[PDB]
């Protein structure tokens, strides 16, 4: 058990001219044709995906794929004024594959619902990982990995209200948010009965380990907006969406209209500061995407009315990467 | 939380112990201490492991739900209030009283200022001066009538190093009413003092 | 060498509102979640809820929700809390605290002074500081710091170089709905014509700063 320096795979096409793809072309070799699945018969061993130095290497991968795919046209750091040219890109993650070097391998947890902290049963050790969309959003975790058993929760305690709590569907529910041609103006449709099915699944679940409690969905707290809206780029354009109506204990049955806002100056999540992009692009702007996990936190205090309320959270986006390398850790032969 | 006991009384040199039982493999706890008239201060974080700068007389023990604080040799510094946080929730906090030797308490008096005198108000001041323990029965009488209902008292908590407190008794009365009578007495009664003390002032 | 320190008291009508600020400084501001904590005057101490300054996350104990709102501001390093719909009940001094690193933050080794909020409809008054003129040995002398209004009050003796044997007492709440306190010094009787003593008497909410004279 040891760190050392991953390197990335992808299908991505030398011709293409989306940016992700002529970044991985760079930065990333071929995507494996023979992938080594090797199932460790009767092993067990203990993973940590809150102390997995492979999220912290993914997150420096995708910040240089940002500072090269979406360059802002002006970044402000109160140490730093940046001024530069800022033309717009194709924009739409593709997956990517994590590997080892010689003399390490990537073990991978085959339980179907381990929680991501503490022993596994049912290991296995691969070269790769598998495809692994950098999908960067707050609040709903877009474009991952579902549960194959289960709904899964993910915490580092439960217990700790201060600690985020990432869960894990075992059934993607669609998202299309859709800006028209205010050029500003935007909206999300959702199945609200895939979602309150989707809601009661989940509260369901986390009675589990709260019994004898209500469980409630709230809006977020406060914070900056895009803790508060479910954020997320889309076509290189960053879309700010009011999700009042999706953490909600009145869930109505019929679609779901999410108000949204497309924003020209951004708080990065790359660092302290802020990202001045240029005006969203004509048309249609329109992402399908599957809503495969929650970032969700939990209203501190003993209740007086035995409730227990989750809301949206999210802004550090080490943890969407460890919502896909739960599952992973790389050890030492 | 179920913090116990709600009061102690010891001496200097007795260690305490102090106990902190919660509800329902996680040993986290922190212990807290709150001066007199100060903001509380952490000694004592993840069950056992002090903080730095605590002296080595501190201790934590305790696992599941019962947790304990023990303070081996009380010291002067050591007299104040102690809370066990669990995460976001905390104890009923245990008020730790230190025991002493009786004190006579040195007895002051002072007679109201001119300025004051010359707004409309008079406030004789009789003061209790580091003494052992706390009761102390302060009377006021102007010649030899005794006042009652515009008299009000106060004591600071423990002092730290001596163990000791202070009274300060304040009897409030109009400018008229003051130059009126002319003489003006505070008797005090403890149990450090064999006949009651009587200081006294005679210029209304 | 972290160091918090809050704003000054602050007295409030039932109804309404009141926001206590928090500047930290010594530390990177954007690292550590802080928390604020509140305490009547008697009791223990209350939970109210945890802000992280780095991106603005809150979490509101369930008691105070819908009228405790936290805020932060990272070109100063300086957290808020803001409670609404005030009662007499809210009349406690709020901390804010700082926990030890960022994965355990609940183990706060680092508290502000403390702002202490009270709710009453009376209204600021600064006090009147009269003296407590002394008459071998060792004799006593002190002033009388009366009719002011909220509770904070901070005396010292010749601009805090006179501590030793110095007692402020408790403030008492008196029938005209004003306190009173009185501070006195031990000094013997062998300096009472040449040591000069003065009395440092301070009421931030009317912002009024007195030194009065103690001379037999
Ligand atoms: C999560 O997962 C889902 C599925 O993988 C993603 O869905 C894709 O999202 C991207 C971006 O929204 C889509 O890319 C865009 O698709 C649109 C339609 O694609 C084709 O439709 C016509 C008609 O069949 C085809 O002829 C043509 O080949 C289109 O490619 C296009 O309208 C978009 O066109 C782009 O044109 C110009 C230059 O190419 C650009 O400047 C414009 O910005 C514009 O984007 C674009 O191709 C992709 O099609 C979606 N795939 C599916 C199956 O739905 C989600 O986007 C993803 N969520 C996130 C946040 O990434
Ligand atoms: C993992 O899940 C079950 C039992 O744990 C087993 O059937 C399965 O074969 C295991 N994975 C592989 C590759 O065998
Ligand atoms: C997966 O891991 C958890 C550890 O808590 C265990 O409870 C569970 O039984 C494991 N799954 C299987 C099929 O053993
Ligand atoms: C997903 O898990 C929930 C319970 O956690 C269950 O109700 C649901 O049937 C599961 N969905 C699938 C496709 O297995
Ligand atoms: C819910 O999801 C399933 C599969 O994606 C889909 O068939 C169904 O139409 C969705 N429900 C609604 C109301 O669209
Ligand atoms: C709350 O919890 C109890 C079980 O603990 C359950 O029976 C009840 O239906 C729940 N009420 C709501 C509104 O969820
Ligand atoms: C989202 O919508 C609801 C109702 O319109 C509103 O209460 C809430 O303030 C909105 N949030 C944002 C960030 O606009
Ligand atoms: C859900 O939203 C509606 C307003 O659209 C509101 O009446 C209701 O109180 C919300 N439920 C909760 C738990 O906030
Ligand atoms: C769905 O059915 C009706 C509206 O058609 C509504 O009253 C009910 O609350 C909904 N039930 C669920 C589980 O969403
Ligand atoms: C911002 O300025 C403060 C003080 O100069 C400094 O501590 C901080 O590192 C700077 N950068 C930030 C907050 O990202
Ligand atoms: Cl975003
Ligand atoms: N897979
Ligand atoms: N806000
Ligand atoms: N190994
Ligand atoms: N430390
Ligand atoms: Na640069
Ligand atoms: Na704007
Ligand atoms: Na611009
Ligand atoms: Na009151």
């Known amino acids: 058990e040891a760190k050392t320096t991953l390197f990335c795979a992808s299908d991505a096409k030398a011709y293409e001219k989306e940016c992700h793809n002529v970044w991985a072309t760079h930065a990333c070799v071929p995507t494996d044709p023979n992938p080594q699945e090797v199932v460790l018969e009767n092993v067990t061993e203990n993973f940590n995906m809150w102390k997995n130095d492979m999220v912290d290497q993914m997150q420096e991968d995708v910040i240089s794929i940002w500072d090269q795919c979406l360059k802002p046209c002006v970044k402000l750091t109160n140490t730093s004024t940046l001024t530069q040219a800022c033309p717009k890109v194709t924009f739409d993650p593709i997956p990517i594959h994590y590997c080892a070097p010689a003399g390490y391998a990537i073990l991978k947890c085959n339980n179907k619902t381990f929680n991501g902290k503490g022993p596994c049963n049912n290991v296995s050790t691969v070269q790769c990982t598998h495809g692994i969309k950098p999908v960067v959003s707050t609040q709903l975790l877009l474009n991952g990995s579902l549960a194959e058993e289960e709904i899964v929760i993910r915490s580092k305690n439960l217990r700790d209200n201060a600690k985020i709590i990432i869960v894990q569907l075992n059934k993607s529910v669609e998202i299309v948010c859709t800006r028209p041609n205010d050029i500003r103006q935007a909206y999300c449709n959702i199945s609200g009965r895939n979602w309150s099915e989707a809601v009661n699944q989940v509260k369901k679940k986390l009675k589990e380990h709260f019994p004898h409690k209500n469980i409630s969905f709230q809006s977020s707290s406060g914070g900056d907006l895009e803790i508060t809206t479910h954020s997320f780029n889309c076509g290189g354009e960053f879309f700010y969406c009011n999700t009042s109506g999706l953490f909600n204990d009145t869930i109505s049955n019929a679609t779901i209209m999410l108000p949204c806002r497309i924003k020209q100056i951004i708080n990065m999540w790359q660092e302290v500061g802020k990202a001045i992009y240029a005006p969203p692009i004509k048309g249609n702007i329109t992402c399908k995407s599957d809503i495969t996990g929650l970032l969700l936190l939990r209203d501190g205090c003993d209740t007086t009315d035995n409730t227990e309320i989750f809301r949206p959270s999210g802004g550090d986006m080490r943890d969407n990467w460890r919502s896909e390398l739960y599952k992973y850790k790389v050890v030492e032969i | 939380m179920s913090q116990s006991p709600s009061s102690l009384a010891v001496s200097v040199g007795e260690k305490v112990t102090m106990s902190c039982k919660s509800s329902q493999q996680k040993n986290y706890l922190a212990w807290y201490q709150q001066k007199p008239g100060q903001s509380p201060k952490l000694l004592i974080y993840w069950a056992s492991t002090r903080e730095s700068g605590v002296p080595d007389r501190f201790t934590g023990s305790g696992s599941g739900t019962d947790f304990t604080l023990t303070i081996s040799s009380v010291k002067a510094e050591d007299l104040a209030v102690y809370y066990c946080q669990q995460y976001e929730t905390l104890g009923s906090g245990t008020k730790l009283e230190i025991k002493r030797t009786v004190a006579a308490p040195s007895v002051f008096i002072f007679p109201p200022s001119d300025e004051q005198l010359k707004s409309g108000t008079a406030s004789v001041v009789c003061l209790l001066n580091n003494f052992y323990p706390r009761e102390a029965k302060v009377q006021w009488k102007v010649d030899n009538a005794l006042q009652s209902g515009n008299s009000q008292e106060s004591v600071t908590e423990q002092d730290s190093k001596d163990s000791t407190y202070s009274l300060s008794s304040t009897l409030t009365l109009s400018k008229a009413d003051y130059e009126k009578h002319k003489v003006y007495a505070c008797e005090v009664t403890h149990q450090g003092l064999s006949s009651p003390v009587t200081k006294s002032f005679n210029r209304g | 060498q972290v160091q918090l320190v809050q704003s000054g008291a602050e007295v409030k009508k039932p109804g309404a509102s009141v926001k206590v600020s928090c500047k930290a400084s010594?530390?990177?501001?954007?690292?550590?979640?802080i928390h604020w904590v509140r305490q009547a005057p008697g009791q223990g101490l209350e939970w109210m809820g945890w802000?992280?300054?780095?991106?603005?996350?809150?979490n509101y104990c369930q008691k105070f929700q819908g009228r405790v709102t936290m805020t932060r501001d990272t070109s100063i390093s300086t957290a808020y809390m803001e409670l609404s719909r005030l009662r007499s009940d809210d009349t406690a001094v709020y901390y804010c605290?700082?926990?030890?690193?960022?994965?355990?933050?609940?183990?706060?080794?680092?508290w502000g002074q403390g702002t202490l909020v009270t709710v009453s409809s009376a209204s600021t008054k600064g006090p009147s500081v009269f003296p407590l003129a002394p008459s071998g040995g060792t004799a006593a002398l002190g002033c009388l710091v009366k009719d002011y209004f909220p509770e904070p009050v901070t005396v010292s003796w010749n601009s805090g170089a006179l501590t030793s044997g110095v007692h402020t007492f408790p403030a008492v709440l008196q029938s005209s709905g004003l306190y009173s306190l009185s501070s006195v010094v031990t000094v013997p009787s062998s300096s009472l014509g040449t040591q000069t003593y003065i009395c440092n008497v301070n009421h931030k909410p009317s912002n009024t700063k007195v030194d009065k004279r103690v001379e037999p």
């Open positions: 605290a700082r926990g030890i690193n960022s994965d355990y933050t609940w183990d706060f080794q680092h």
């Open positions: 010594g530390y990177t501001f954007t690292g550590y979640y």
């Open positions: 802000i992280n300054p780095n991106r603005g996350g809150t």
